Design an enzyme around this catalytic site. Structure first.
Site, short mmCIF file in Angstrom:
data_model
loop_
_atom_site.label_atom_id
_atom_site.label_comp_id
_atom_site.label_asym_id
_atom_site.label_seq_id
_atom_site.Cartn_x
_atom_site.Cartn_y
_atom_site.Cartn_z
N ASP B 25 22.28 60.16 43.23
CA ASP B 25 22.49 59.08 43.29
C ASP B 25 23.79 59.08 44.40
O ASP B 25 24.93 58.92 43.96
CB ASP B 25 22.97 58.27 42.24
CG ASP B 25 22.83 56.75 42.41
OD1 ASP B 25 22.97 56.16 43.69
OD2 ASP B 25 23.27 55.90 41.34
N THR B 26 23.29 58.87 45.79
CA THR B 26 24.25 58.94 46.80
C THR B 26 25.02 57.61 46.91
O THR B 26 26.16 57.60 47.63
CB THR B 26 23.50 59.05 48.19
OG1 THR B 26 22.42 57.85 48.34
CG2 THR B 26 22.92 60.49 48.16
N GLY B 27 24.49 56.51 46.02
CA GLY B 27 25.01 55.05 46.36
C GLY B 27 26.09 55.17 45.12
O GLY B 27 26.90 54.17 44.93
#
Ligand SMILES: CC(C)CN(C[C@@H](O)[C@H](Cc1ccccc1)NC(=O)O[C@H]1CO[C@H]2OCC[C@H]21)S(=O)(=O)c1ccc(N)cc1
Lengths: 99, 99
Positions: B25-27
């Site tokens: 999850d890059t967010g």
């Protein structure tokens, strides 16, 4: 480009004639933007995150340019603390994770 | 590996002697896991997500194996609807976005 993750993967997008900043978010199914005006029909949708369920407006087939790549897809609008580009648009610009 | 985003980027992790699945999850700034037991001291921390502020427990220097790569780092534990590996641990395994 190759984007490392020491910093938030924020890029500039253009949508409905506005320049905004947004997060490239592989943890998001759908693209969700802070309150704005978009043209055309929309349906109410619910999504879930850390914090619970959130009511949003779904617009479909919306043109959006993302870090120089042009795309068309679904955009959700609602009380998000961050503009986020989710998988539905990340796939459109050929975005992958690599390690 | 190269992971495309037509599907959720879910991988197997090992932590506290358990196998779990988690979302790359890059967010997410931080790694947040659904309720579990971890050893050692923890501090209360607050994070924000789409649905508001959420109280979590922070544990530091926790070993975790992610899709075959060994890492050590901070793990948050709380009422998340999903196990998510955030940037603090994605950097540790050399994960980048590419398009
Ligand atoms: C929890 C995931 C399954 C989904 N979330 C995407 C996720 O990437 C959010 C995206 C995000 C980013 C900022 C604020 C809210 C949500 N990050 C997040 O909740 O991370 C928290 C943990 O570390 C901290 O770093 C950033 C926020 C904290 S989500 O925002 O709730 C979400 C859910 C559905 C859609 N379509 C779009 C987004």
């Amino acid at each position: 480009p190759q984007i490392t993750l020491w910093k938030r993967p924020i890029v500039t997008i253009r949508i409905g004639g506005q320049l905004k900043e947004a997060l490239l978010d592989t943890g998001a199914d759908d693209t969700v933007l802070e309150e704005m005006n978009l043209p055309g029909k929309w349906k109410p949708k619910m999504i879930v995150g850390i914090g619970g369920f959130v009511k949003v407006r779904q617009y479909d087939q919306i043109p959006i340019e993302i870090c120089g790549h042009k795309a068309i897809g679904t955009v959700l609008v609602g009380p998000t603390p961050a503009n986020i580009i989710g998988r539905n648009l990340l796939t459109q610009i050929g975005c992958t994770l690599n390690f």
